[PDB]
């Protein structure tokens, strides 16, 4: 019952390599190989760029003066930018350039965990002497394909309209192929080899990918009602002034339930709340059938 | 109000029908609505307001 | 009768989903049924899916 | 970037020598690789 | 009465009034989905003629029922896109609003 | 709407789009929702599925 292992990993390019597995019993090259191909293509860490805020751009459907690329084209180009990070799950970079000439991927400011695999990669060109583009490229890490459309549900104030969300291309793997040839080890009846020839963008090492693949593969074998809802709404739902909201939050009042417990006395004793603010709060609470000094006794359940 | 009843009655009319009239009644309502104001009573009616 | 008119122009981006109609130039119509992962795709000896 | 394991098994077996087992959630495309690699091992080896 | 394009809309939260400018027109470049208010519009309808249970409801909760109905233009259900343009046409002789 | 295959289906069933089924059974959804008590009132049910 011989278990396999790896052997010479031949790197022919920054792009792709051929990993090989010596000790494989009868027919196991296929069983292991295809299963490995699956996890390899499907589930793998990736760092693909997500959010991009550009200079004078409100939407991806405009054209910036001084660049022959449409903004949507520039986003599509960025999506094809391959980067690798170490300690950060999400880093934000800053791109800056001007004058006549191509803007490559090496024109960005270099950070601690930033590694650019394709410095020659073209983000966009520059057509005029004085024309300049700055942008924040927000790069985060994830698995699989996360389109830009499903990215908005959580929402939670993506208000900086200058920020254009882009589809997530997370995956090192481009092409994976596995060939089994009979492998003759010195002494043994008949054994097979596994030549997995994979294609990458360079952001993942072959040994690393081949490792995590079988890591996950084995990892699957591991099993082989009273009170008002309004009381739990955040204070922002009350739509108070910025000052009042910040003051309340500073007094550990984050929800409506917290506010309706406080009395006028107690609120006036705070360092930042005057009579105007209290008037506002009482007004907005009364406008929704609420008030101060309300008792709900049992704060909180779970 | 006119609830499950024909038209509706002035506070004085409600006073005539209650034998205890005027300001008195106006107070009850104020304390009545009040009892309905606070939640666990008001949470059902609150959702009706959009 | 109309005092003022406000025209907003939306740009919607849709890609492809089951139910869409696709055809070649030869009069062969069709409708996308399911969107299959690259994993399940038939692939040649080179390893390139279809 | 944590992963997903199944969490709703239910082995429904007919008689004794026969069995039909089912596994509820599983990430997309994991069902085929597991099902197949296993069928291959079960039959051939 | 005359209808208004004003940003003042009866019965809407700040989340609703967020996407509109002071004049009541959605900002350029603001991504929207179904239900978002593109253009706030309000039309006069007076004396709503309510009923007894409604009259009780209002006096309990103390809400002034507006004399204005909400006609605002909102994104059709199911469609989601980004606003790339806004054009305002005004009758010759009627005062142009702020946004316009 | 446009139709697709779904060979995985049993003879006695058909694939129905989520949104479609939501819009179609809307009154049933309201009724069940306030039947179990997930919704205070029908208005609340509407607001919920909306």
UniProtKB/Swiss-Prot annotation, chain A:
Effect listed in the UniProt record for changing residue 38 to C: In rpoA112; temperature-sensitive, blocks RNA polymerase assembly
Annotated stretches, region: Alpha N-terminal domain (alpha-NTD): 1-224
EC number from the UniProt entry: 2.7.7.6
Residue(s) carrying ADP-ribosylarginine: 243
Pfam families with a match to the protein in the record: RNA_pol_A_bac, RNA_pol_A_CTD, RNA_pol_L
Superkingdom of the source species: Bacteria
Cysteine disulfide partners in this protein: none
Biological process, per Gene Ontology: bacterial-type flagellum assembly; bacterial-type flagellum-dependent cell motility; cell motility; cellular response to cell envelope stress; DNA-templated transcription initiation; intracellular iron ion homeostasis; nitrate assimilation; regulation of DNA-templated transcription elongation
Entry GO CC: cytoplasm; cytosol; cytosolic DNA-directed RNA polymerase complex; membrane; transcription elongation factor complex
GO MF, one example: DNA-directed RNA polymerase activity
Record field: catalytic activity: RNA(n) + a ribonucleoside 5'-triphosphate = RNA(n+1) + diphosphate
Region (Required for interaction with Crp at class II promoters): 155-158
EC class of the enzyme, as a word: transferase
Keywords in alphabetical order: Acetylation, ADP-ribosylation, DNA-directed RNA polymerase, Nucleotidyltransferase, Transcription, Transferase
Post-translational modifications: Acetylated on Lys-275 and Lys-276 in the presence of glucose. PatZ controls acetylation of Lys-276 but not of Lys-275. (Microbial infection) ADP-ribosylated on both alpha subunits by the phage T4 protein ModA. ADP-ribosylated on only one of the alpha subunits by the phage T4 protein Alt.
Residues bearing PTM N6-acetyllysine: 275-276
SMART domains: RPOLD (SM00662)
Annotated segments matching region Alpha C-terminal domain (alpha-CTD): 227-302
Family of the protein in this entry: Belongs to the RNA polymerase alpha chain family.
Record protein name field: DNA-directed RNA polymerase subunit alpha
Provenance organism: Escherichia coli (strain K12)
From Swiss-Prot, chain B:
Highest taxon in the source lineage: Bacteria
Localization annotation: Cytoplasm
Annotation: DNA-binding region: 11-30
Region called Interaction with anti-sigma factors, residue ranges: 22-37
Sigma-70 factor domain-4: annotated span: 1-38
Family under the similarity heading: Belongs to the sigma-70 factor family. RpoD/SigA subfamily.
Protein purpose: Sigma factors are initiation factors that promote the attachment of RNA polymerase to specific initiation sites and are then released. This sigma factor is the primary sigma factor during exponential growth. Preferentially transcribes genes associated with fast growth, such as ribosomal operons, other protein-synthesis related genes, rRNA- and tRNA-encoding genes and prfB.
Subunit structure, interactors included: Interacts transiently with the RNA polymerase catalytic core formed by RpoA, RpoB, RpoC and RpoZ (2 alpha, 1 beta, 1 beta' and 1 omega subunit) to form the RNA polymerase holoenzyme that can initiate transcription. Identified in a complex containing RpoD, the RNA polymerase subunits RpoA, RpoB and RpoZ, CRP and DNA. Interacts with Rsd; this prevents interaction with the RNA polymerase catalytic core and with promoter DNA, and as a consequence, promotes transcription from promoters that require alternative sigma factors.
Domain text: Contains 4 domains, connected by flexible linkers. In the active conformation, the domains are in an extended conformation, each making extensive interactions with the RNA polymerase catalytic core.
Protein name listed in UniProt: RNA polymerase sigma factor RpoD
Gene: rpoD
Shown part of the complete sequence: 563 to 612 of 613
Swiss-Prot record, chain C:
Protein name from the UniProt record: DNA-directed RNA polymerase subunit beta
Function of the molecule: DNA-dependent RNA polymerase (RNAP) catalyzes the transcription of DNA into RNA using the four ribonucleoside triphosphates as substrates.
Quaternary structure note: The RNAP catalytic core consists of 2 alpha, 1 beta, 1 beta' and 1 omega subunit. When a sigma factor is associated with the core the holoenzyme is formed, which can initiate transcription. The rRNA transcription and antitermination complex (rrnTAC) consists of RNAP, NusA, NusB, NusE (rpsJ), NusG, SubB, ribosomal protein S4, DNA and precursor rRNA; S4 is more flexible than other subunits. In pull-down experiments interacts with CedA.
PTM: Acetylated on several lysine residues in the presence of glucose.
Gene name linked to the record: rpoB
Family to which the UniProt record says this protein belongs: Belongs to the RNA polymerase beta chain family.
Disulfide bond annotation, renumbered to this chain: none
Parent sequence residues shown: 1045 to 1094 of 1342
Applied biotechnology: Co-administration of salinamide and rifampicin or salinamide and myxopyronin suppresses the emergence of resistance to both antibiotics.
Record organism: Escherichia coli (strain K12)
Swiss-Prot record, chain F:
Changes after translation: Acetylated on several lysine residues in the presence of glucose.
Biotechnology and industry use: Co-administration of salinamide and rifampicin or salinamide and myxopyronin suppresses the emergence of resistance to both antibiotics.
Taxonomic superkingdom: Bacteria
Self-association state and partner proteins as the record states: The RNAP catalytic core consists of 2 alpha, 1 beta, 1 beta' and 1 omega subunit. When a sigma factor is associated with the core the holoenzyme is formed, which can initiate transcription. The rRNA transcription and antitermination complex (rrnTAC) consists of RNAP, NusA, NusB, NusE (rpsJ), NusG, SubB, ribosomal protein S4, DNA and precursor rRNA; S4 is more flexible than other subunits.
Family note: Belongs to the RNA polymerase beta' chain family.
Function: DNA-dependent RNA polymerase (RNAP) catalyzes the transcription of DNA into RNA using the four ribonucleoside triphosphates as substrates.
Protein name: DNA-directed RNA polymerase subunit beta'
Residues of the full protein shown: 353 to 402 of 1407
